[PDB]
Amino acid sequence: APAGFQLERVVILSRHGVRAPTKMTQTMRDVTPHQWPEWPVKLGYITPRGEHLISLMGGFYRERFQQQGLLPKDNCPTPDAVYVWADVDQRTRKTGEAFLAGLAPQCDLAIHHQQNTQQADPLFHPVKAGICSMDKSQVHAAVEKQAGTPIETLNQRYQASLALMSSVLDFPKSPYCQQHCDFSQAMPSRLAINDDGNKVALEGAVGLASTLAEIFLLEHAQGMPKVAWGNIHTEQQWNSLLKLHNAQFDLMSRTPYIAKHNGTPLLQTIAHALGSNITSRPLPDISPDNKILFIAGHDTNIANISGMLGMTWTLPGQPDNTPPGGALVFERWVDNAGKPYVSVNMVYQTLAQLHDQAPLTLQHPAGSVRLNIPGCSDQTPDGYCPLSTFSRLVSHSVEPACQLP
Ligand SMILES: [Cl-]
Ligand SMILES: [Cl-]
Ligand SMILES: [K+]
Ligand code: NA
């Protein structure tokens, strides 16, 4: 950092770690003659390896923040300094615990989360929680705007990637094709919404391939002996398959109309934690002297925040834009005249770092991409957005109806 700059605190919005598939539907089984490999935990759970991998990130964060004077160079942080808010799911709660175990091994720290884990946390899922609702016609129009073309035509944008997915699956030899054969032709894209407008999905080949491609990446990150039945051989193939996943996320999570309805609570919380002079539902029991706020959520949350702030990225060595344990790290810096700024980085394990379970240290670091905020036209060439500007950008991107009551 520049002479005189001081790191005052950090807010980390992290995806959970490596998990088993959330579901394995009959369509997912039917589109390949091969058998999907069994995971060593319940569907949707983080695996012990996933936990380990998150702890490696915690250790990296410890080294980075110690070097910047934010945490002590040895022995436990004071507990007021570090706070975890995790979503209700096993995968997110255990990610929060694994982060603490890497950040502060054998320190007696515990996470926080919503008391009732059987209901949505409106910080992560305000629409499912009933805080606000989307208008179905507006969703359809906003997704088309984001795609730049009618959604029914989306497969035509991804012919090579869909053909590769077909070959990796051996789709033409699949029970699906014995009952219903070209992967793209068989499964045209369409946007499906429930009656209330609170459940939205991209149906068809791109949506399905997005899910499958992420499962292969997860298998790889889990160190399974057979990933995609041995059918992914090259970096180009990984990139081509994950292109479908990143596109699905751009459409279904980055699209600003959707992103602000799902992301308002989190963006307000993050901004407030960085020092924006706004009203935000307080996190229970958080200290005024908090230095590190770690929020354990989902890929969709990171994508929503990216859409609200107009941030886009590609991660060297990591084909998924929202990889397991990848996090947006928001840093509040002040210069020697006491002016506050926000920097934002995407910090992540490369595909190799996941697969190899690489130790992460300052000498052998996690990946990190410094982000441009396009609306922050005063952002410095070295990446610092004046907090006063960041605050105004947040204020214009949030949906007031979706603020936590
Ligand atoms: Cl289990
Ligand atoms: Cl495991
Ligand atoms: K900028
Ligand atoms: Na999945």
Author numbering: 4 to 183, 189 to 413
Quoted passage from the original study:
Phytases (myo-inositol hexakisphosphate phosphohydrolases) catalyse the hydrolysis of phytate into inorganic phosphate (Pi) and lower phosphorylated myo-inositols. Here we report the identification of two HAPPs from the enterobacteria Hafnia alvei (HaPhy) and Yersinia kristensenii (YkPhy), together with biochemical studies of their pH and temperature optima, as well as their phytate degradation pattern, which show that they are 6-phytases. The enzymes share a common catalytic site architecture located at the interface of the two domains involving the conserved N-terminal active site motif RHGXRXP and the C-terminal HD. The two-step reaction involves a nucleophilic attack on the phosphorous by the histidine from the RHGXRXP motif to form a covalent phosphohistidine intermediate while the aspartic acid of the HD motif serves as a proton donor to the oxygen atom of the scissile phosphomonoester bond.
The first attempt to co-crystallise HaPhy with the substrate analogue MIHS, at pH 8.4–9.1 led to the tar-HaPhy crystal. The structure was isomorphous to that of the apo-enzyme with the same disordered residues. The active site contained a tartrate molecule, a component of the crystallisation buffer and a well-known inhibitor of HAPs. The tartrate superimposes rather closely with the 6-sulphate moiety in the MIHS-HaPhy complex and the Pi in the Pi-YkPhy complex described below. There is a second tartrate, modelled with an occupancy of 0.25, close to a two-fold rotation axis, where it coordinates with His116 and Gln118 from two symmetry related HaPhy molecules. Perhaps it was not surprising that MIHS failed to bind at this high pH, since the optimal pH for HaPhy activity is ∼4.5 (see 4.1).
